[PDB]
Amino acid sequence: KVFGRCELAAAMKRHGLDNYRGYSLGNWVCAAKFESNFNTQATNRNTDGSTDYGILQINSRWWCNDGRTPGSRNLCNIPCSALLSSDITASVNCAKKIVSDGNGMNAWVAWRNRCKGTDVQAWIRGCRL
Ligand SMILES: [Pt+4]
Ligand SMILES: [Pt+4]
Ligand SMILES: [Pt+4]
């Protein structure tokens, strides 16, 4: 599913992401926009053989099992395919574990490079929440 900006903001808010670990909603919407362009079905292969999955491009090296990343850790305890669903629940629950891991949203390279220190509130501007 390709989400609209406000539709996704609303889903993320409902799933407990607004101010999760201090990160306002706008940060999460910005990350999703540049990681996956709001497409739950996004996959991208990394040079090390791992793959990133779904709306928040969660990586198979640490977080999920895809059966093809030797020495992966499956920390969210989930097949990576579950992260591609139109229901964002699995992605959100896993993202909560990731952002709690010590490096906050810096775990998402597009967030660091494209959202961090920008006016992220603009991403939720005009939405009914
Ligand atoms: Pt709502
Ligand atoms: Pt939902
Ligand atoms: Pt594996």
Q: Which residues are catalytic?
A: 35, 52
Measured in angstroms, how far is the CA atom of residue 14 from the centroid of ligand 2?
A: 7
Residue whose C-alpha is closest to residue 60's, from 50, 45, 71, 47: 50
66 is in an annotated binding site: no
Tell me how many degrees the CA angle 66-68-74 measures, rounded to the nearest 5. Answer: 45
Residue 39 C-alpha to ligand 3 middle, in angstroms? 24
Give the C-alpha separation, 92 to 73, whole Å.
Answer: 18
Distance 122 CA to ligand 3 centre (A): 38
The resolution in angstroms reads 2.0
Experimental method: X-ray
Domains of the chain with bracketed CATH: 1-129 (1.10.530.10)
Ligand (nearest to CA of 73): 3
Q: CB–CB of 58/98 below 8 Å?
A: yes
Q: How far is residue 62's CA from residue 69's CA, in Å, rounded to a whole number?
A: 10
